[PDB]
mmCIF file of C-alpha atoms in Angstrom:
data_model
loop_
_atom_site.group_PDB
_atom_site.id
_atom_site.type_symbol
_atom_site.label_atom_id
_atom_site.label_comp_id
_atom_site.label_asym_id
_atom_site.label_seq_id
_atom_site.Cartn_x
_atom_site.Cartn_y
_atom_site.Cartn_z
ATOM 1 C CA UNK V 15 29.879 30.010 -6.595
ATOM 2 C CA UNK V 16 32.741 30.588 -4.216
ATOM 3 C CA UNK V 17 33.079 26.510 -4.092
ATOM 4 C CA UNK V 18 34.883 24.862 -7.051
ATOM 5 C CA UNK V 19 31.887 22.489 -6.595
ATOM 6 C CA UNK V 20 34.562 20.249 -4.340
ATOM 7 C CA UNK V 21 31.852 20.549 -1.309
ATOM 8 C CA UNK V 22 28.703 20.609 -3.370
ATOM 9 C CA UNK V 23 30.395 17.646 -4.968
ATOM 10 C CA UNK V 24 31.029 15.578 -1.835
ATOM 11 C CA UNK V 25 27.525 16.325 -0.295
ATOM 12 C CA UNK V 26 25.995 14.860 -4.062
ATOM 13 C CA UNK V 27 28.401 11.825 -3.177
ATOM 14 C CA UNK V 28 26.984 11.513 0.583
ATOM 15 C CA UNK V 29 23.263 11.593 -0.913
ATOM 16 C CA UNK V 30 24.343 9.067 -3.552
ATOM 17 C CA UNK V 31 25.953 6.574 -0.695
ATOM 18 C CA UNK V 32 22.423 6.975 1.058
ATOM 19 C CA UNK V 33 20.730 5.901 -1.935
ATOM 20 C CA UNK V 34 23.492 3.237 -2.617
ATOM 21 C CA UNK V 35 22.826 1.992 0.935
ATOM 22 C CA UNK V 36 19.153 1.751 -0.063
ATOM 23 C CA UNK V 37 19.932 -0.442 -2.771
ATOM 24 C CA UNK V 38 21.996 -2.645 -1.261
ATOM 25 C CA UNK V 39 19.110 -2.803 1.619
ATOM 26 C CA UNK V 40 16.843 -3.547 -1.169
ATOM 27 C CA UNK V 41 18.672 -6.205 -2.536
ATOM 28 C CA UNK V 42 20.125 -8.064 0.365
ATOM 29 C CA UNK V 43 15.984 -7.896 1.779
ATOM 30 C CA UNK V 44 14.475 -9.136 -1.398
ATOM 31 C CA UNK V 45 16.543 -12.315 -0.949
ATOM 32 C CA UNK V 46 16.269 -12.701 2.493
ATOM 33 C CA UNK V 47 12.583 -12.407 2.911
ATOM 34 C CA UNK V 48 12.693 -15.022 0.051
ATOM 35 C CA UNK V 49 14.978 -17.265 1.931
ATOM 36 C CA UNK V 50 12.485 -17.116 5.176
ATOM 37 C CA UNK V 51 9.513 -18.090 3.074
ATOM 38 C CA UNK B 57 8.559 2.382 3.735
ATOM 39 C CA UNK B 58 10.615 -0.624 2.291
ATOM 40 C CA UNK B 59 12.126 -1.441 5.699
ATOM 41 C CA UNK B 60 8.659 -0.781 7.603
ATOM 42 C CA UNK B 61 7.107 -3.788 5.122
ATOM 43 C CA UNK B 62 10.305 -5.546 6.178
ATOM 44 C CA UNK B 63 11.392 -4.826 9.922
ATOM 45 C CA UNK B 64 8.298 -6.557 11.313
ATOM 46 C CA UNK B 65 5.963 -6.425 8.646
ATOM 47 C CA UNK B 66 7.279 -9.428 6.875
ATOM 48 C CA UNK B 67 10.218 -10.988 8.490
ATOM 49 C CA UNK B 68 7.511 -12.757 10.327
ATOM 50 C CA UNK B 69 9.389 -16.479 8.826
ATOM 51 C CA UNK B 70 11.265 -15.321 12.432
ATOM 52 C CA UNK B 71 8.383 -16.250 14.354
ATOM 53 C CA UNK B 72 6.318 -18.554 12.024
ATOM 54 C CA UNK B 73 9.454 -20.676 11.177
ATOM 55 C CA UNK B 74 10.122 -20.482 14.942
ATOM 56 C CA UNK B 75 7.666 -21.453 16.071
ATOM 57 C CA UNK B 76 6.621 -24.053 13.273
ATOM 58 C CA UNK B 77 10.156 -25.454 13.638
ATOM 59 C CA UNK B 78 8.864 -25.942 17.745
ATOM 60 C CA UNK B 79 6.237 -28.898 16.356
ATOM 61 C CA UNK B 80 8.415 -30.622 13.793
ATOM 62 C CA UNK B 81 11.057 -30.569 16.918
ATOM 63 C CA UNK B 82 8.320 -31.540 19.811
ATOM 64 C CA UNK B 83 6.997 -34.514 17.192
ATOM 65 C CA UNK B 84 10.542 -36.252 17.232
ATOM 66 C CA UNK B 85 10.353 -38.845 19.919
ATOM 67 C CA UNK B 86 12.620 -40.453 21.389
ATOM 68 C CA UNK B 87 11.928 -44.404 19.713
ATOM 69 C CA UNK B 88 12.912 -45.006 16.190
ATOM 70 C CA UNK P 98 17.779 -56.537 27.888
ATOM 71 C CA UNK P 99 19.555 -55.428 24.300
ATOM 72 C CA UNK P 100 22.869 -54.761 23.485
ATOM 73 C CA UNK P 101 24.155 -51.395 21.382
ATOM 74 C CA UNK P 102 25.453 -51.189 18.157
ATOM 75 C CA UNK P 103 27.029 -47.390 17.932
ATOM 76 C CA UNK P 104 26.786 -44.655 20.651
ATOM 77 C CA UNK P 105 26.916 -41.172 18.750
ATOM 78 C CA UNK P 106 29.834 -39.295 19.969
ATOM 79 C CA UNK P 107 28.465 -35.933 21.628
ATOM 80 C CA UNK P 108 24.596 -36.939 20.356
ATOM 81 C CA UNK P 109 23.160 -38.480 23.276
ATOM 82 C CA UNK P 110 21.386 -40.725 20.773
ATOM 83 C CA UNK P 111 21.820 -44.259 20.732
ATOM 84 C CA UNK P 112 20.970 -46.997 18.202
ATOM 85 C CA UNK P 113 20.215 -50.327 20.162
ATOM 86 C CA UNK P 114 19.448 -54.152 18.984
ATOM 87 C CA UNK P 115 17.232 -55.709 21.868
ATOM 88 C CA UNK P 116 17.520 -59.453 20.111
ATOM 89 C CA UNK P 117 14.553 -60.865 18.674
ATOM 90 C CA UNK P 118 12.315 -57.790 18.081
ATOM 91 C CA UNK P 119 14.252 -55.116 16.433
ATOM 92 C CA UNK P 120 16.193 -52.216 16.254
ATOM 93 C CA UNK P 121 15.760 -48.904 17.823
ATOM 94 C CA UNK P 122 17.030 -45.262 18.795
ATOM 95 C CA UNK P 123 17.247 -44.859 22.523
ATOM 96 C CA UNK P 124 17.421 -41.869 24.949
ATOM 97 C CA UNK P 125 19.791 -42.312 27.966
ATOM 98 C CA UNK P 126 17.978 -42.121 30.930
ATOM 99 C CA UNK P 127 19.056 -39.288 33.590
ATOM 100 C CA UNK P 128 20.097 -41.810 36.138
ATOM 101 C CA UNK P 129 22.495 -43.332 34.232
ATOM 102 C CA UNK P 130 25.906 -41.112 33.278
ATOM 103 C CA UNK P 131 26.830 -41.545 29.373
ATOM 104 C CA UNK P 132 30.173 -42.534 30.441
ATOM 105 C CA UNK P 133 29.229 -45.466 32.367
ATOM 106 C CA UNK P 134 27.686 -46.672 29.485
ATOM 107 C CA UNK P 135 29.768 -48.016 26.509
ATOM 108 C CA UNK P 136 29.400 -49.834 22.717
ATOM 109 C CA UNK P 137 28.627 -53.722 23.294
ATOM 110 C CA UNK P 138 27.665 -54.124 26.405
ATOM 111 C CA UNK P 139 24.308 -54.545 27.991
ATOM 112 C CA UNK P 140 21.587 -52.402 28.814
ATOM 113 C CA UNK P 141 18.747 -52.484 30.520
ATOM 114 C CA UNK P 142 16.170 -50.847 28.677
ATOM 115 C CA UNK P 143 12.547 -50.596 29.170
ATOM 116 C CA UNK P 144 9.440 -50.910 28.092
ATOM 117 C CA UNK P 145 7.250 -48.254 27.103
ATOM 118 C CA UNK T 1 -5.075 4.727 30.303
ATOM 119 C CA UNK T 2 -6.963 4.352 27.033
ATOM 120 C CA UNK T 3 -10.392 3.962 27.450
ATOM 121 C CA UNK T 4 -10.916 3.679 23.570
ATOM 122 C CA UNK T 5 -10.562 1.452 20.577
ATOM 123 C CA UNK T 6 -9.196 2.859 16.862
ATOM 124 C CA UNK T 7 -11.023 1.868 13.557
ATOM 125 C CA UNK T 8 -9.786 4.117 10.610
ATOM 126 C CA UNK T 9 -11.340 4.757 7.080
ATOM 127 C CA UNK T 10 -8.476 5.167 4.706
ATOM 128 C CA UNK T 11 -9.849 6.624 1.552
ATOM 129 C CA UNK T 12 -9.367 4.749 -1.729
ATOM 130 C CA UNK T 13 -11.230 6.345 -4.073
ATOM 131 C CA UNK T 14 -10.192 7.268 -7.748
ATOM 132 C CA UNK T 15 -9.256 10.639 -6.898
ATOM 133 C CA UNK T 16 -6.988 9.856 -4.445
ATOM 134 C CA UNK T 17 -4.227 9.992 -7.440
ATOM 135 C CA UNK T 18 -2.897 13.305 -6.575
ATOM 136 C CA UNK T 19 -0.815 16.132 -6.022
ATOM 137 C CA UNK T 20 -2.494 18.552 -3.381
ATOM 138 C CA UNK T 21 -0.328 17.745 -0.005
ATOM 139 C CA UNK T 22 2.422 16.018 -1.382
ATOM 140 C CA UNK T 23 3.497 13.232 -3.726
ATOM 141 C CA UNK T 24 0.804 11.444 -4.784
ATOM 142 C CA UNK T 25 -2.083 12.297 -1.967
ATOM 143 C CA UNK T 26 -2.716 8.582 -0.370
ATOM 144 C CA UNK T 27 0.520 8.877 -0.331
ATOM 145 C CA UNK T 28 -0.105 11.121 2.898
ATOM 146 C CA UNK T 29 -3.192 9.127 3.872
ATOM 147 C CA UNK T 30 -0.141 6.524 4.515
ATOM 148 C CA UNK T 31 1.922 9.387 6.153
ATOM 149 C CA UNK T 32 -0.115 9.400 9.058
ATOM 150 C CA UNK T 33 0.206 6.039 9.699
ATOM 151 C CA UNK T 34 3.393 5.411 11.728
ATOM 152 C CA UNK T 35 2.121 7.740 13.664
ATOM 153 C CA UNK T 36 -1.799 8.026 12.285
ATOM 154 C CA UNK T 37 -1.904 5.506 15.718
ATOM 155 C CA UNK T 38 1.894 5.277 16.013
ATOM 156 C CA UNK T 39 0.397 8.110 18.384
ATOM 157 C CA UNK T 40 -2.188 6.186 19.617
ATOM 158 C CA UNK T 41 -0.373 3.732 20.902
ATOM 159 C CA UNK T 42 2.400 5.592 21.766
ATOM 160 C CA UNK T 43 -0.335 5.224 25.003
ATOM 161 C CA UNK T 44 -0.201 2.354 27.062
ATOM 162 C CA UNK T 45 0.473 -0.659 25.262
ATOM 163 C CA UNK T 46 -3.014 -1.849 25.499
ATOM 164 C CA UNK T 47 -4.513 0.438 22.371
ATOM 165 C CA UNK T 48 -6.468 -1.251 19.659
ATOM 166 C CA UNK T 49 -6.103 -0.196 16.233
ATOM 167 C CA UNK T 50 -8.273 -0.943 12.998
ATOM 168 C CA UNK T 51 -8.107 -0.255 8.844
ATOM 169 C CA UNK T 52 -11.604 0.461 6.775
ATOM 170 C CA UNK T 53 -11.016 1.509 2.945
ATOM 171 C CA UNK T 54 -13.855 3.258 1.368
ATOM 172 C CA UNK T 55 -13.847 2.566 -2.311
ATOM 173 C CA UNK T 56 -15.961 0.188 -3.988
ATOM 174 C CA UNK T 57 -18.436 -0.009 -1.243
ATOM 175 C CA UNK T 58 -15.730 -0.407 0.807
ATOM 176 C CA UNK T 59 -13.936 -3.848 2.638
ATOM 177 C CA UNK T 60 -12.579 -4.446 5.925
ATOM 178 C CA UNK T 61 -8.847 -4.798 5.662
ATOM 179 C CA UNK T 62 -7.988 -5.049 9.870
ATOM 180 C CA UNK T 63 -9.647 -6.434 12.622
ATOM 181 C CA UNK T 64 -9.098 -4.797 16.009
ATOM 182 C CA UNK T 65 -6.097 -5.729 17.327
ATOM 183 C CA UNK T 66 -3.127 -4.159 19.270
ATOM 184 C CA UNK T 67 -0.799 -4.477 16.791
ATOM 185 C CA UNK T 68 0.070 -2.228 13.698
ATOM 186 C CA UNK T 69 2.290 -4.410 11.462
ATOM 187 C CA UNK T 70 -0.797 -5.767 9.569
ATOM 188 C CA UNK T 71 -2.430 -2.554 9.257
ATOM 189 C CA UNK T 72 0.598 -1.118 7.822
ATOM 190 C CA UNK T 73 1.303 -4.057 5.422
ATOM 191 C CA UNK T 74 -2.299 -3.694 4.567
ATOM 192 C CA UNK T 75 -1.779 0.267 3.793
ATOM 193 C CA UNK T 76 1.003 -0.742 1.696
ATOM 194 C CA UNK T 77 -1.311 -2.149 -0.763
ATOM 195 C CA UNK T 78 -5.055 0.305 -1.185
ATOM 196 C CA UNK T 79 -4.479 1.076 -4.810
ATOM 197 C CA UNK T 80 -7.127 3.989 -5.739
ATOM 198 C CA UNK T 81 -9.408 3.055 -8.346
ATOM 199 C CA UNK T 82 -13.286 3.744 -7.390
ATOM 200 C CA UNK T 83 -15.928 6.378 -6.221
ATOM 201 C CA UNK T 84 -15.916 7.123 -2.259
ATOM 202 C CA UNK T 85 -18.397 5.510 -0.286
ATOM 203 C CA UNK T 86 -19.675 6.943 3.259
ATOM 204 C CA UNK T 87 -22.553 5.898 5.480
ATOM 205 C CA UNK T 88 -22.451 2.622 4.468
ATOM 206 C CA UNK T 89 -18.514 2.866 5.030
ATOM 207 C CA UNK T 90 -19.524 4.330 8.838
ATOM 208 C CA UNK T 91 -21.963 1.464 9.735
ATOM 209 C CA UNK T 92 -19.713 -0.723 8.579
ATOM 210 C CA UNK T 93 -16.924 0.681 11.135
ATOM 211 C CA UNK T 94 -19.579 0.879 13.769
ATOM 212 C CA UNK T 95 -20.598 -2.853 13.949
ATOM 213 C CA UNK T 96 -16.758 -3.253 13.667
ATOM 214 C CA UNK T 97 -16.396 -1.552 16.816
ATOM 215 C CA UNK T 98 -19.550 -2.983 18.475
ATOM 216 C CA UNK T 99 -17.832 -6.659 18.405
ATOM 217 C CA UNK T 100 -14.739 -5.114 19.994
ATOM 218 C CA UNK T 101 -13.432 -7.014 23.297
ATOM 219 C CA UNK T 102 -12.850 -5.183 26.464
ATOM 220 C CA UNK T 103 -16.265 -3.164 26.949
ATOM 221 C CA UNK T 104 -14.317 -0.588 28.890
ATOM 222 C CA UNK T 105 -12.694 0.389 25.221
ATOM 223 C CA UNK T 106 -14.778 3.777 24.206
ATOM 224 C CA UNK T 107 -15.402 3.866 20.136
ATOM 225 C CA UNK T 108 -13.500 6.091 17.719
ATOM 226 C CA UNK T 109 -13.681 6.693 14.044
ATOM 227 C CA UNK T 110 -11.201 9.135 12.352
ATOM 228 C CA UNK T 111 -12.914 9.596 8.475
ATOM 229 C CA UNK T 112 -10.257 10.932 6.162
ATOM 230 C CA UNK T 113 -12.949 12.405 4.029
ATOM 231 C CA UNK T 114 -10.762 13.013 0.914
ATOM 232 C CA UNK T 115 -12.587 13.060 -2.517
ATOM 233 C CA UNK T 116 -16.261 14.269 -2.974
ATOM 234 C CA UNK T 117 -18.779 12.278 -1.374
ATOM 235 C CA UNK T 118 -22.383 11.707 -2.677
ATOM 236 C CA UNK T 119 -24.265 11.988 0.601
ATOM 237 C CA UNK T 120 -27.510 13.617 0.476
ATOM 238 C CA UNK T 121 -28.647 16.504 3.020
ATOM 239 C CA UNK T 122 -30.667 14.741 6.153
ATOM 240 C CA UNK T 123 -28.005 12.168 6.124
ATOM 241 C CA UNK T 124 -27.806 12.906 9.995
ATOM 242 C CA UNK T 125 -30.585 10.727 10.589
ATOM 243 C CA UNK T 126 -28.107 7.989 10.428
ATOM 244 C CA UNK T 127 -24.945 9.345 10.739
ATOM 245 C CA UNK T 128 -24.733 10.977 14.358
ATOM 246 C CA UNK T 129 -28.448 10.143 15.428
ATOM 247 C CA UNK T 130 -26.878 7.244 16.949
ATOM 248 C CA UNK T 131 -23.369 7.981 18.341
ATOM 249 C CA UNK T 132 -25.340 9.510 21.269
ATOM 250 C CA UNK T 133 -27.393 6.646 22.375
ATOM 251 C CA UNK T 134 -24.119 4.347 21.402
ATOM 252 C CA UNK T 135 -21.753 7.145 22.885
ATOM 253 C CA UNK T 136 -19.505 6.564 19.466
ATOM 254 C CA UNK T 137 -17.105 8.891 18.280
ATOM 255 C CA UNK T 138 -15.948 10.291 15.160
ATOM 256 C CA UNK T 139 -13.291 11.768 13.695
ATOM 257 C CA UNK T 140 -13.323 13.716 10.129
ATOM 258 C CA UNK T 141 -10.347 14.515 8.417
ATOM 259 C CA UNK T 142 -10.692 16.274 4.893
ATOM 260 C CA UNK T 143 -7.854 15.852 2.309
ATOM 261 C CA UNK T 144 -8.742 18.608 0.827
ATOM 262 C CA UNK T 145 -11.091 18.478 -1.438
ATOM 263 C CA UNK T 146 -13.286 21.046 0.376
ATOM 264 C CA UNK T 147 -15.846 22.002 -1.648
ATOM 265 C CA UNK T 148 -17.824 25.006 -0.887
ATOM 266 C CA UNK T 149 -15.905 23.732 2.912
ATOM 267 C CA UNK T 150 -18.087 21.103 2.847
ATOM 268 C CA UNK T 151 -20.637 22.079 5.406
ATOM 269 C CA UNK T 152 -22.274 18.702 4.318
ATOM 270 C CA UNK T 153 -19.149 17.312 6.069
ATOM 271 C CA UNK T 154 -18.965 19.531 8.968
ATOM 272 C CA UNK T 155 -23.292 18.929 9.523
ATOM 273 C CA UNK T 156 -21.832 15.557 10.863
ATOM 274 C CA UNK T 157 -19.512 17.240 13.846
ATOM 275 C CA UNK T 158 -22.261 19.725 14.043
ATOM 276 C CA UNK T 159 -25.302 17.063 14.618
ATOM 277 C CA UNK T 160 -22.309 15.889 16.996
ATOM 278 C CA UNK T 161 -21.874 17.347 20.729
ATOM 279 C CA UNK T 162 -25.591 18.966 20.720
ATOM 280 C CA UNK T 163 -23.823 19.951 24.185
ATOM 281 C CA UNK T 164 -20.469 18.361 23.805
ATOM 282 C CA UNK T 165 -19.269 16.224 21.786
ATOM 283 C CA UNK T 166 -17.166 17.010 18.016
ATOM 284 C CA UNK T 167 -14.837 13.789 19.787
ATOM 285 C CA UNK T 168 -11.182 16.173 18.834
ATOM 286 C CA UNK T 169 -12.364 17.843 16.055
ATOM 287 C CA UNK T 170 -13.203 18.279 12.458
ATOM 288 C CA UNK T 171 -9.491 19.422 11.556
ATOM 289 C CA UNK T 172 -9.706 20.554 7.993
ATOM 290 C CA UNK T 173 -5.959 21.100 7.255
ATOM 291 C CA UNK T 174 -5.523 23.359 4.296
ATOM 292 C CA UNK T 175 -5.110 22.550 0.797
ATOM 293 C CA UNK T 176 -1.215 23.492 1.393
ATOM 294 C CA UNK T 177 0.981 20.419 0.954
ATOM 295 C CA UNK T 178 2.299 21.353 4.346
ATOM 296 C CA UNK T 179 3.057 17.949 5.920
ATOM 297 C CA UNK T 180 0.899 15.694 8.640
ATOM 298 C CA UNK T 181 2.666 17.642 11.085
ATOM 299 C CA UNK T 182 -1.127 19.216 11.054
ATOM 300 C CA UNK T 183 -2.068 15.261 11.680
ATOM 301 C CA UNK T 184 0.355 15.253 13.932
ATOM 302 C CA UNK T 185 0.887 18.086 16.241
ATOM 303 C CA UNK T 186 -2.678 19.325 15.098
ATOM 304 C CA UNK T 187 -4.155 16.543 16.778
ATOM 305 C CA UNK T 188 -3.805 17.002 20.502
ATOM 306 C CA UNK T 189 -4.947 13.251 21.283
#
């Protein structure tokens, strides 16, 4: 409670860059395993 | 997961192709 | 003997007319250096 | 290093769909893996490696082999849909590992007993009768599932050893959906 959800808020930001990272993983892979074959 | 059916578990075109490319190279002789 | 037609700039291939026979793509033998050989004149290819 | 060869019987049956050690149960039969030999080989990079499902009668999805990229893009794909099969799944594992190369390789089997099997009481008679004479071993995992602690199970460690024997052991790891830390750190090979 003592955080104006400012830190809570940036670690929620971190964990969605991860997942954004996945995705971008995910689609720059599904077109370049489809290039090789 | 994802990347562990992609590092080396597919990605294998980096060998195959490779190596495939190898033959279609070796095949052209010299005459034409 | 055969004359040459073109020399591909930085492709050590060369296209070649002997005279009677045909036409060909030739490799440049190690012995010889590229720059001793030029478009037009005469080489000395063999057979094989 | 390694005198040994790897042949593995990941479960496919119907009840693998799951929640009882985390996500979806196989899902955990997979966790292993990248390390369910990752381990294995972290030996001397002369380890063989193999992949036996156990549905359906069971198939052969990995030939032995010193590599691990197949038998993890195979693992990717071992949808559950069928009734467990044993026995039949062992022999099939043993011939496996009879026509493996490099004689000096001893035989291993790590069972991931997971859902029920059917397996009747003097199944001994071919299940361990033979490992002696053949100096096979096998290893029993049970995701979870451990009825009444399946002492059918354990009769197969038990008929095992007679003296030594039990190969590691029959590591039971409990029902809690701890991790495969227990198939990891558990496992002392």
């Amino acid at each position: 409670m003592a955080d104006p959800r400012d830190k809570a808020l940036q670690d929620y930001r971190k964990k969605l860059l991860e997942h954004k990272e996945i995705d971008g993983r995910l689609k720059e892979l599904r077109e370049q395993l489809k290039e090789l074959t | 997961s994802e990347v562990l059916r992609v590092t080396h578990e597919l990605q294998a075109m980096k060998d195959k192709i490779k190596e495939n490319s190898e033959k279609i190279k070796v095949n052209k002789t010299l005459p034409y | 003997c055969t004359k040459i037609i073109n020399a591909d700039s930085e492709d050590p291939k060369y296209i070649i007319n002997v005279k009677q026979f045909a036409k060909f793509v030739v490799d440049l033998s190690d012995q010889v250096a590229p720059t001793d050989i030029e478009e037009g004149m005469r080489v000395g290819v063999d057979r094989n | 290093m390694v005198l040994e060869s790897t042949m593995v019987c990941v479960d496919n049956s119907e009840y693998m769909r799951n929640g009882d050690f985390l996500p979806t149960r196989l899902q955990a039969q997979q966790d292993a893996v990248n390390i369910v030999c990752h381990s294995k080989t972290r030996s001397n990079p002369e380890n063989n490696v193999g992949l036996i499902t156990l549905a359906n009668d069971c198939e052969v999805l990995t030939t032995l082999t010193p590599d691990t990229g197949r038998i993890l893009s195979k693992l990717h794909t071992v949808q559950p849909k069928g009734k467990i099969t044993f026995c039949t799944g062992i022999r099939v594992a043993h011939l496996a590992l009879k026509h493996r190369q490099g004689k000096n390789h001893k035989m291993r089997i790590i069972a991931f007993v997971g859902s029920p099997v059917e397996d009747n009481e003097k199944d001994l008679v071919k299940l361990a009768k033979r490992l002696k004479k053949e100096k096979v071993n096998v290893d029993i995992i049970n995701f979870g599932e451990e009825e009444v602690n399946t002492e059918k199970l354990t009769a197969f460690v038990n008929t095992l050893n007679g003296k030594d024997g039990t190969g590691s052991h029959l590591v039971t790891v409990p029902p809690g959906p701890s991790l495969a830390d227990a198939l990891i750190s558990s496992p002392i090979l």
